């Protein structure tokens, strides 16, 4: 998007902020633009960030297997692009979540683990 | 029973939260520092300036912000040694 | 994210950042090193049973 000079990237959504007739855009704490006013229609729109985070690969070692599962940290499983499991720590893909319990093997975070169980 | 009355103290736990929150608030604020650059935002320069000129500008904004990361990581290592020494004392008392 | 903190979205920047040697990767590694020890700290204090 570009709003009369403001160049950026993000998702545009209906806002609930109220600008003073002379203001064009707003910024949040830490001084980053978080709302704009459309020059043509004069409506206030929020700008939310395009999802991100690190990507890590979980591997048992090529001398055990070549399978792998991937956890996208605090990414919803609907905004990533079998076994898909949503946890409070992110989106876990490639492992099935069970209700049993074993000893930690490969820590995944927040109480969850994984291993090459048959 | 008197212990609850003395609570309803934990400043040592709030200080840990504060120190990290302050380093993360400072790390972000250091991006609005022209550091000696026409503009402090990247795209503007890299999009309101030729391709060989913007070089100098962005090169000026990279060294400054790379120094910011070195400061941040060095302090986290020094501060993590202090919480580690505290965790060793807590494990020993346990 | 070293590349997203410094450059930020821009792609003309990425080729310039690859100049500054591995100053970038070292940073990431140190930060993660502080990540493995913080979970071990907790296990040593509480997981004594």
């Amino acid at each position: 998007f570009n709003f009369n000079g403001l160049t950026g990237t993000g998702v545009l959504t209906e806002s609930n902020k109220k600008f003073l007739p002379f203001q064009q855009f707003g910024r949040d704490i830490a001084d980053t633009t978080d709302a704009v006013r459309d020059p043509q229609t004069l409506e206030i729109l929020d700008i939310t960030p395009c999802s991100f985070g690190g990507v890590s690969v979980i591997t048992p070692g090529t001398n055990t297997s070549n399978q792998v599962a991937v956890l996208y940290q605090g990414v919803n499983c609907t905004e990533v692009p079998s076994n898909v499991f949503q946890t409070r720590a992110g989106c876990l893909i490639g492992a099935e979540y069970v209700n049993n319990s074993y000893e930690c093997d490969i820590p995944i975070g927040a109480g969850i683990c994984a291993s090459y169980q048959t | 029973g008197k212990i609850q009355d003395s609570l309803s103290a934990l400043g040592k736990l709030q200080d840990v939260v504060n120190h990290n929150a302050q380093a993360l608030n400072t790390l972000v604020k250091q991006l609005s520092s022209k550091f000696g650059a026409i503009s402090s935002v990247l795209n503007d320069i890299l999009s309101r300036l030729d391709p060989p000129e913007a070089e100098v500008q962005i090169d000026r904004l990279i060294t400054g912000r790379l120094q910011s990361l070195q400061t941040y990581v060095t302090q986290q290592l020094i501060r993590a040694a202090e919480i580690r020494a505290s965790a060793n004392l807590a494990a020993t008392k346990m | 994210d070293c590349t997203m903190y410094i450059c930020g979205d821009s792609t003309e920047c990425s080729n310039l950042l690859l100049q500054y040697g591995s100053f970038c990767t070292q940073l990431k590694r140190a930060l993660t090193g502080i990540a493995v020890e913080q979970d071990k700290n907790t296990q040593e204090v509480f997981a004594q049973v």
Binding site: A30, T32, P49, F52, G53, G54, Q73, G74, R88, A89, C104, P107, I108, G109, A110, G111 | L24, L27, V28, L31, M94 | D1, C2, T3, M4, Y5, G8, A35, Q38, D39, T42, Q43, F46, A47, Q48, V49
Partner: peptide, 29 residues
């Protein structure tokens, strides 16, 4: 969340820590 900054979750939840503490209390008493 910020411009490339992220906070990772702990490996042990606070429920799991509570279970270590109750085990130490039940053993001792």
């Amino acid at each position: 969340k910020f411009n490339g900054l992220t906070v990772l979750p702990p490996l042990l939840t606070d429920e799991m820590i509570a279970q270590y503490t109750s085990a130490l209390l039940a053993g001792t008493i």
